[PDB]
């Protein structure tokens, strides 16, 4: 018990620069601080599971995730994903407080790696969508530090 | 699924005006923002337990208890009590994090509060230990605004 419950927060941002796929779903985990970040097409709840199957490859399963009010979070379809996993589904809180500034930050910090990385390959528009992947994978090494 | 977690943060402060039992036990529910605290001669495992029997009856069962690494809070004694509750203890995370802010300015509301109606009774110093009680549950009730 000795170190923070496994709670995530998950949202969806935009990026024109990572159309036609400029969907980012960000989950942070709060216990580790640790980001994982996918690309979809399209918001959907099918888009959100996708990306929390690869958010469960790369940081385990979590005891619960934390989203908005979503409808691709709070359809059927998630409601009953999330239950075939075992993870409770929770909201913010009250206190005059938002949804969930950590993935907001995050959302920030990604946007503005991306950013830098595609400038400094001379991207300065959409990036090229053969070499989306590997720069996403690149800022998200770098926001994780390692 | 639709709310927060019921998760707890936990901690005590010194209020002197409060001696002989100047320790406050102070607990904020993150999902209601509703606070809890009783007074305690000193800091104890069995006085954190005291305390979380008295938060149980007047906000139910939570799912996790948040403290520091406090001994009261880490001994056997404290580990058992709340294996014998079912309810999971955990600590503040990482990300350049203290603590825990929100039950931080739970004390701090607390002994401002506490402060004004013992003056506005006309106690300067120490509340008389006969008043103590009553003092308390009518700050309580202030803070939680009903
Ligand atoms: C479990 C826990 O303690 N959670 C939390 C601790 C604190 S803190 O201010 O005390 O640091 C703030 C929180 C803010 C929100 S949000 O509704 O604004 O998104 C949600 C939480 O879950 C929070
Ligand atoms: C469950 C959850 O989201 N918890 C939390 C959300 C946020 S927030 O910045 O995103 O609002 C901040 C938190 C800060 C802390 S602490 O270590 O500083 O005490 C602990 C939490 O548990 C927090």
Same mark, same amino acid.
């Given at each position: 018990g000795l170190g923070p419950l496994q709670i995530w927060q998950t949202d969806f941002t935009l990026e024109?620069?990572?159309?036609? /796929? =400029?969907w980012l779903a960000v989950t942070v985990?709060?216990? =580790? =601080?640790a980001i994982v970040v996918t690309q979809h097409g399209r918001v959907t709840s099918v888009a959100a599971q996708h990306h929390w199957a690869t958010a469960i490859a790369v940081?385990? /399963?979590?005891?619960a995730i934390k989203t908005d009010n979503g409808s691709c979070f709070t359809s059927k379809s998630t409601r009953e994903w999330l239950a075939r996993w075992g993870i409770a589904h929770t909201t913010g809180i009250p206190g005059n407080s938002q949804g969930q500034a950590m993935v907001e930050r995050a959302n920030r910090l990604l946007k503005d790696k991306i950013r830098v990385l595609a400038e400094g390959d001379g991207f300065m528009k959409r990036i090229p969508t053969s070499k989306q992947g590997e720069l996403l994978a690149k800022a998200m090494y770098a926001l994780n530090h390692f």
């Open positions: 024109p620069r990572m159309a036609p /796929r =400029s985990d709060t216990a =580790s =601080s940081l385990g /399963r979590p005891k």
